[PDB]
Write an enzyme that holds these catalytic residues in place. Sequence first.
Site, PDB file in Angstrom:
ATOM      1  N   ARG A 185       0.841  -1.192   0.000  1.00  0.00           N
ATOM      2  CA  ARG A 185       0.000   0.000   0.000  1.00  0.00           C
ATOM      3  C   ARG A 185       0.864   1.225   0.000  1.00  0.00           C
ATOM      4  NH1 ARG A 185      -5.208  -0.535   2.323  1.00  0.00           N
ATOM      5  NH2 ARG A 185      -4.927  -0.830   4.581  1.00  0.00           N
ATOM      6  N   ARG A 228      -4.233   3.955  17.000  1.00  0.00           N
ATOM      7  CA  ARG A 228      -5.174   3.508  15.960  1.00  0.00           C
ATOM      8  C   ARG A 228      -4.942   4.209  14.598  1.00  0.00           C
ATOM      9  NH1 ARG A 228      -9.336  -0.576  16.330  1.00  0.00           N
ATOM     10  NH2 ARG A 228      -8.592  -1.190  14.244  1.00  0.00           N
ATOM     11  N   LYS A 229      -5.501   3.646  13.531  1.00  0.00           N
ATOM     12  CA  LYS A 229      -5.507   4.330  12.248  1.00  0.00           C
ATOM     13  C   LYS A 229      -6.114   5.746  12.373  1.00  0.00           C
ATOM     14  CE  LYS A 229      -8.117   2.393   8.784  1.00  0.00           C
ATOM     15  NZ  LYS A 229      -9.397   2.717   8.129  1.00  0.00           N
ATOM     16  N   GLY A 289     -16.601  -6.827   2.397  1.00  0.00           N
ATOM     17  CA  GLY A 289     -16.540  -8.253   2.668  1.00  0.00           C
ATOM     18  C   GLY A 289     -16.710  -8.652   4.115  1.00  0.00           C
ATOM     19  N   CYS A 299     -14.609  -1.551   4.846  1.00  0.00           N
ATOM     20  CA  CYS A 299     -13.645  -0.928   3.947  1.00  0.00           C
ATOM     21  C   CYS A 299     -14.305  -0.337   2.718  1.00  0.00           C
ATOM     22  CB  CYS A 299     -12.599  -1.935   3.534  1.00  0.00           C
ATOM     23  SG  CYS A 299     -11.553  -2.295   4.918  1.00  0.00           S
ATOM     24  N   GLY A 300     -15.301  -1.060   2.202  1.00  0.00           N
ATOM     25  CA  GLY A 300     -16.049  -0.675   1.008  1.00  0.00           C
ATOM     26  C   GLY A 300     -17.133   0.359   1.258  1.00  0.00           C
TER      27      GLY A 300
HETATM   28  C1  SRM Z   1      -7.781  -1.451   0.274  1.00  0.00           C
HETATM   29  C2  SRM Z   1      -8.937  -1.165   1.252  1.00  0.00           C
HETATM   30  C3  SRM Z   1     -10.206  -1.806   0.695  1.00  0.00           C
HETATM   31  C4  SRM Z   1     -10.264  -1.544  -0.809  1.00  0.00           C
HETATM   32  O1  SRM Z   1     -10.370  -2.501  -1.581  1.00  0.00           O
HETATM   33  O2  SRM Z   1     -10.191  -0.413  -1.346  1.00  0.00           O
HETATM   34  C5  SRM Z   1      -8.574  -1.496   2.679  1.00  0.00           C
HETATM   35  C6  SRM Z   1      -7.850  -2.604   3.036  1.00  0.00           C
HETATM   36  C7  SRM Z   1      -7.833  -3.205   4.267  1.00  0.00           C
HETATM   37  N1  SRM Z   1      -8.489  -2.752   5.352  1.00  0.00           N
HETATM   38 FE1  SRM Z   1      -9.618  -1.146   5.432  1.00  0.00          FE
HETATM   39  N2  SRM Z   1      -9.313  -0.775   3.537  1.00  0.00           N
HETATM   40  C8  SRM Z   1      -9.812   0.244   2.798  1.00  0.00           C
HETATM   41  C9  SRM Z   1     -10.638   1.247   3.222  1.00  0.00           C
HETATM   42  C10 SRM Z   1     -11.104   1.324   4.492  1.00  0.00           C
HETATM   43  C11 SRM Z   1     -12.029   2.402   4.895  1.00  0.00           C
HETATM   44  C12 SRM Z   1     -12.575   3.512   4.042  1.00  0.00           C
HETATM   45  C13 SRM Z   1     -11.829   4.802   4.218  1.00  0.00           C
HETATM   46  O3  SRM Z   1     -10.706   4.875   4.803  1.00  0.00           O
HETATM   47  O4  SRM Z   1     -12.379   5.821   3.743  1.00  0.00           O
HETATM   48  C14 SRM Z   1     -12.300   2.137   6.306  1.00  0.00           C
HETATM   49  C15 SRM Z   1     -13.212   2.906   7.260  1.00  0.00           C
HETATM   50  C16 SRM Z   1     -12.783   4.297   7.691  1.00  0.00           C
HETATM   51  C17 SRM Z   1     -12.393   4.101   9.124  1.00  0.00           C
HETATM   52  O5  SRM Z   1     -11.239   3.706   9.362  1.00  0.00           O
HETATM   53  O6  SRM Z   1     -13.194   4.290  10.065  1.00  0.00           O
HETATM   54  C18 SRM Z   1     -11.503   0.897   6.558  1.00  0.00           C
HETATM   55  C19 SRM Z   1     -11.473   0.298   7.786  1.00  0.00           C
HETATM   56  C20 SRM Z   1     -10.772  -0.822   8.141  1.00  0.00           C
HETATM   57  C21 SRM Z   1     -10.827  -1.329   9.531  1.00  0.00           C
HETATM   58  C22 SRM Z   1     -11.637  -0.778  10.698  1.00  0.00           C
HETATM   59  C23 SRM Z   1     -10.964   0.111  11.759  1.00  0.00           C
HETATM   60  C24 SRM Z   1     -11.708  -0.053  13.091  1.00  0.00           C
HETATM   61  O7  SRM Z   1     -11.609   0.788  14.038  1.00  0.00           O
HETATM   62  O8  SRM Z   1     -12.462  -1.064  13.270  1.00  0.00           O
HETATM   63  C25 SRM Z   1      -9.963  -2.510   9.438  1.00  0.00           C
HETATM   64  C26 SRM Z   1      -9.581  -3.478  10.524  1.00  0.00           C
HETATM   65  C27 SRM Z   1      -8.669  -2.703  11.454  1.00  0.00           C
HETATM   66  O9  SRM Z   1      -7.923  -1.739  11.082  1.00  0.00           O
HETATM   67  O10 SRM Z   1      -8.680  -3.038  12.657  1.00  0.00           O
HETATM   68  C28 SRM Z   1      -9.472  -2.544   8.043  1.00  0.00           C
HETATM   69  C29 SRM Z   1      -8.621  -3.525   7.609  1.00  0.00           C
HETATM   70  C30 SRM Z   1      -8.149  -3.618   6.338  1.00  0.00           C
HETATM   71  C31 SRM Z   1      -7.161  -4.665   5.879  1.00  0.00           C
HETATM   72  C32 SRM Z   1      -5.734  -4.224   6.191  1.00  0.00           C
HETATM   73  C33 SRM Z   1      -7.493  -6.032   6.489  1.00  0.00           C
HETATM   74  C34 SRM Z   1      -6.290  -6.942   6.524  1.00  0.00           C
HETATM   75  O11 SRM Z   1      -5.746  -7.279   7.603  1.00  0.00           O
HETATM   76  O12 SRM Z   1      -5.811  -7.369   5.458  1.00  0.00           O
HETATM   77  C35 SRM Z   1      -7.476  -4.632   4.431  1.00  0.00           C
HETATM   78  C36 SRM Z   1      -6.315  -4.975   3.524  1.00  0.00           C
HETATM   79  C37 SRM Z   1      -6.977  -6.012   2.613  1.00  0.00           C
HETATM   80  C38 SRM Z   1      -6.244  -6.288   1.309  1.00  0.00           C
HETATM   81  O13 SRM Z   1      -5.407  -7.238   1.261  1.00  0.00           O
HETATM   82  O14 SRM Z   1      -6.458  -5.600   0.274  1.00  0.00           O
HETATM   83  N3  SRM Z   1      -9.973  -1.531   7.314  1.00  0.00           N
HETATM   84  N4  SRM Z   1     -10.801   0.447   5.488  1.00  0.00           N
HETATM   85  C39 SRM Z   1      -9.268   0.252   1.436  1.00  0.00           C
HETATM   86  C40 SRM Z   1      -8.022   1.052   1.857  1.00  0.00           C
HETATM   87  C41 SRM Z   1      -7.306   2.021   0.906  1.00  0.00           C
HETATM   88  C42 SRM Z   1      -6.194   2.816   1.583  1.00  0.00           C
HETATM   89  O15 SRM Z   1      -5.280   3.343   0.912  1.00  0.00           O
HETATM   90  O16 SRM Z   1      -6.163   2.977   2.832  1.00  0.00           O
HETATM   91  S1  SF4 Z   2     -14.119  -4.677   4.353  1.00  0.00           S
HETATM   92 FE1  SF4 Z   2     -11.849  -4.562   4.614  1.00  0.00          FE
HETATM   93  S2  SF4 Z   2     -11.264  -6.142   6.185  1.00  0.00           S
HETATM   94 FE2  SF4 Z   2     -13.403  -6.561   5.411  1.00  0.00          FE
HETATM   95  S3  SF4 Z   2     -13.083  -8.015   3.705  1.00  0.00           S
HETATM   96 FE3  SF4 Z   2     -13.046  -5.932   2.742  1.00  0.00          FE
HETATM   97  S4  SF4 Z   2     -10.855  -5.284   2.655  1.00  0.00           S
HETATM   98 FE4  SF4 Z   2     -11.033  -7.044   4.099  1.00  0.00          FE
END
Ligand code: SRM
Ligand code: SF4
EC number: 1.7.7.1
Length: 535
Positions: free
Chosen positions: A88, A202-203, A460, A465-466
């Site tokens: 990333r 946290r993020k 998913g 994330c979506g």
């Molecule tokens: C790539 C992306 C989905 C996508 O297909 O586009 C992504 C990818 C991942 N997200 Fe996300 N998130 C993506 C947008 C989001 C968004 C939308 C946004 O940022 O506008 C959110 C919600 C906004 C927020 O944070 O409140 C989001 C909230 C999460 C969370 C929830 C955080 C929480 O407090 O629960 C997780 C799980 C975590 O971090 O604990 C997560 C976890 C993950 C992980 C790292 C899960 C993992 O362990 O592998 C995903 C990587 C999966 C992979 O192999 O591709 N992702 N994820 C999006 C990130 C692009 C980027 O450059 O950052």
């Molecule tokens: S919403 Fe995020 S953590 Fe859940 S399946 Fe999609 S990329 Fe993975």
Amino acid sequence: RLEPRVEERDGFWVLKEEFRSGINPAEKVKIEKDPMKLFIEDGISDLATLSMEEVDKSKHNKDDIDVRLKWLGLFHRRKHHYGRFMMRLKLPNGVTTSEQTRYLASVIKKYGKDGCADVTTRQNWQIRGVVLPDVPEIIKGLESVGLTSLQSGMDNVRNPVGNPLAGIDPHEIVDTRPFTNLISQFVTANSRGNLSITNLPRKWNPCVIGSHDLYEHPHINDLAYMPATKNGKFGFNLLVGGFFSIKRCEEAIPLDAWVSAEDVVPVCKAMLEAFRDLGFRGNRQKCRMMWLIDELGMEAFRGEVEKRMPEQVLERASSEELVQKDWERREYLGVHPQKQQGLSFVGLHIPVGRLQADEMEELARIADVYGSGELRLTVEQNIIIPNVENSKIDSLLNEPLLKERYSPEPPILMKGLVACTGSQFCGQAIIETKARALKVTEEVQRLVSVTRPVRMHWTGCPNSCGQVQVADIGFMGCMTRDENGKPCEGADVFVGGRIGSDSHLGDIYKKAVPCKDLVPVVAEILINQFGAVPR
Ligand code: SRM
Ligand code: SF4
């Protein structure tokens, strides 16, 4: 209490001993070895040595691979791509050059059937397939073309998003580029790494608004800069705390602060430090910044940011706002006029964001040949070719991978289609998304016709994330069981989420729809809530 729980020791930031009580497994990993040491002390060169056998042989190596490495933007896909990584980036604003995308395509190539790329929902690149032995060479590679992939992953500041039309937009409130870059450059300490800021609880999602349509989705960010003038001088009112989680979804809210153009980085610095210092670090689902905020109350939290900054004054929010509330979101897919006379941008489809190595090269080549040699990624997982001369439009619309794969004019439901990585590569995922999404849309356009643009989001797993909560119609993966008890991939369906100035979050509307029954349900919502017609 409200005494900072982290101090500087030997250059790295660490949670003090006496505040170590309830802390979660991630907090234990950070303590055992600051993850930035993988980059700063070149721990990464030693990691590229280990075979996977050696890595999994010890708890310390398995933390590095699976957690620590996220600070270098390298994500191990243990469950689905064992021994391979997703990488990333850092891409303020979604702006990437044809050299970058080309260079990316070349890293991808090396893995054939096991490389692909993705535009993420923060207009960012994800590269897929990499293996440790390649990382040291890939980091040099990314740096040599503008990119860093530093701090993209755990408890860091994520990709600063801005207006995708920044600096080309006819109706642009502020060119957003300088600010997203300023922020990106700040947090990353110019690709060198800002250690003061990599030990957050946290993020943290930041964004900067320059468009009346609010493409930057301010309501969904931890920190959202909103254009407003104060005393002739231009600047932003601050919205604060927005986030999606398994356990909670909260819309961002006024901090009641205004900040001048020059003060953008300062507040961000101050606020990150307030977070780092004061945030909860126990149960992980209570750690995003909004929790700290309701714990202290808004004012006490403002006080905390305020006192943390240069002159210890944080100006109050101004009433003079620049975004125009009554406004309808412009289409960007297709041919649109720029603010530069005689130039147009072309927004391109990108089915679900997925791209292959051969196809990335062609976009890159098309940007060079028709545009200014760059591309704009966007939060709906599509990319816009900026700055083409109107003379060249015709030929451009006539290019093979515009006719075939990436259409400037796809069908109407595709236009606003977004989906997360899904279970194809993501360890966390309850269902497969990207392919399922194109299949369900396909069959839906077959069965109904819609005139209104409609936004469907697949995610998913409840991490969202979506961004299912922003969608007209949303799909959150769950598992279901037949009347015979047979496990079938299915989704919760969200209706009613709203984008732009009058934003709202969608509600679960029908729970646990199995994948075979999914299309009927969608069709029936389309006809009942979106003026669609059978046939
Ligand atoms: C790539 C992306 C989905 C996508 O297909 O586009 C992504 C990818 C991942 N997200 Fe996300 N998130 C993506 C947008 C989001 C968004 C939308 C946004 O940022 O506008 C959110 C919600 C906004 C927020 O944070 O409140 C989001 C909230 C999460 C969370 C929830 C955080 C929480 O407090 O629960 C997780 C799980 C975590 O971090 O604990 C997560 C976890 C993950 C992980 C790292 C899960 C993992 O362990 O592998 C995903 C990587 C999966 C992979 O192999 O591709 N992702 N994820 C999006 C990130 C692009 C980027 O450059 O950052
Ligand atoms: S919403 Fe995020 S953590 Fe859940 S399946 Fe999609 S990329 Fe993975």
